A and B are shown apart, each in its own frame.
With several copies, the nearest count.
Chain A
Amino acid sequence: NRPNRLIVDEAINEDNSVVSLSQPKMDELQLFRGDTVLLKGKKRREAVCIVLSDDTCSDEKIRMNRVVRNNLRVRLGDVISIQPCPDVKYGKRIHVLPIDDTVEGITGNLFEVYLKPYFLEAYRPIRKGDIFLVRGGMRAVEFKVVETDPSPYCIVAPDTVIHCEGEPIKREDEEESLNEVGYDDIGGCRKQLAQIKEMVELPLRHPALFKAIGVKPPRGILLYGPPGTGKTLIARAVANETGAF
């Protein structure tokens, strides 16, 4: 429901290789086929990929990486204010997270081979938390850092080989993290729960607006009394959706 929200459909590839940025998308925003794009993703999905602008084949609505968006739980149609992310620069030796599931199928020190293929001209989306096609040792070596606060991807010199983590990250933890409790499970009370969540968020997303209302913001919100349906579901979904301790 925002002007910075083009109609993002699935790209011609499930990865960010065959994205089709609209002519209007490439025009109103500096949306190049090969430009770093700080798009918007749900559940804290920082997208800094280079989505292609395949408006030449079809100047249709926005086309988004299907696999990458699904893995990042991104919204195909959200307001992806895809801006350059040159400010986020990576360190020379960052804690690169070598996943055990990434090595679960890779042969030999294919991590080093992929890193050599990934250190310079990684040929994949430059982000974290999504499904990026990473091939190494005849396997899917997604031995990437989960995220880096500055430059989740290699936004440093191509030779700046981040110090890979020695421990291999097992697939069970990744599956548990991916099966998070999103706000999608928070349906039904799309009036009361929605109102409470909006009250919490506006206090967090526009506290200046609440102060400028002239009246003081609500000091808090006591939650609805659930009749045994299990309010832990709503609480966990909110806590996952919320950046609060």
Chain B
Amino acid sequence: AVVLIDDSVPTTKIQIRLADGSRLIQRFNSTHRILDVRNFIVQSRPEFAALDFILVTSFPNKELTDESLTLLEADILNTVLLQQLK
């Protein structure tokens, strides 16, 4: 779970729901990019590291193709966002 967590920066409790429904809630700072979130998921879970892990919400379907997007632009604060490994 290597996520950029900082109290001074804007932290967001991103409840990253797994493919089985496991809401991996992480309070990642807004400065962290989507690459930081992907690295946190890979470190905390090797099942998504070995697969094409793209964060796609159920409603609506939008895969996290751009891993350079900052956590501030992601808008996943206190949100149950589904995650799938492909």
Query: A–B direct touch, CB within 8 Å, in complex?
Result: yes
Chain A residues within 8 Å of B, Cβ to Cβ: 26-27, 30-36, 50, 84, 86, 89, 121, 123, 155
- Can you sample 21 A-B contacts with CB below 8 Å? A26-B78, A27-B78, A30-B15, A30-B80, A31-B78, A32-B15, A32-B78, A32-B79, A34-B59, A34-B79, A34-B80, A35-B15, A36-B80, A50-B58, A84-B23, A89-B21, A121-B59, A121-B61, A123-B59, A123-B60, A155-B21
Contacts A26-B78, A84-B80 given; does A34 touch B23 at CB 8 Å? no
B21 touches A121 (CB 8 A): no
- Give chain A residues whose Cβ lies under 8 Å from the Cβ of B79: 32-35
Interface range on chain B (Cβ under 8 Å from partner) = 10 to 19
- Shortest distance from the beta carbon of B82 to any chain A beta carbon, whole Å: 9
Encoded as 1 (CB less than 8 Å from any A CB) or 0, chain B from 39 to 73 comes to: 00000000000000000011111000000000000
Inter-chain contacts of B59 with A (CB < 8 A): 34, 50, 121, 123
Q: Which chain B residues (72-86) contact chain A, with CB distance < 8 Å?
A: 78-81
Task: Assess whether B78 is in contact with A34, with CB atoms less than 8 Å apart.
Answer: no
**Dominant SS at the A interface?**
loop
CB-contact partner of A86 in B23, B57, B78, B81, under 8 A: B23
Q: Which residue of A lies closest to B57 (CB)?
A: A34
Which residues of B lie under 8 Å from residue A155 when comparing CB positions? 21
When distances are taken between beta carbons in the complex, the residues of chain B under 8 Å from A123 are 59-60
B17 contacts which chain A residues (CB < 8 A)?
A: 86
Known A86-B21, A86-B23; judge A35-B60 contact (CB<8 A): no
Question: What are the residues of chain A within 8 A of B78 when measuring CB–CB?
Answer: 26-27, 30-32
- Contacting A32 at CB < 8 Å: which of B21, B61, B80? B80
The answer on a CB contact under 8 Å between A34 and B81 is yes
CB distance from B56 to the nearest CB of A (A): 9
Q: Say how far A54's CB is from chain B's closest CB, in angstroms.
A: 13
B-chain residues with CB within 8 Å of residue A86 when the two chains form the complex: 17, 21, 23
**Cβ contacts under 8 Å, A27 to chain B:** 78
Which A residues lie within 8 Å of B57 (CB)? 34
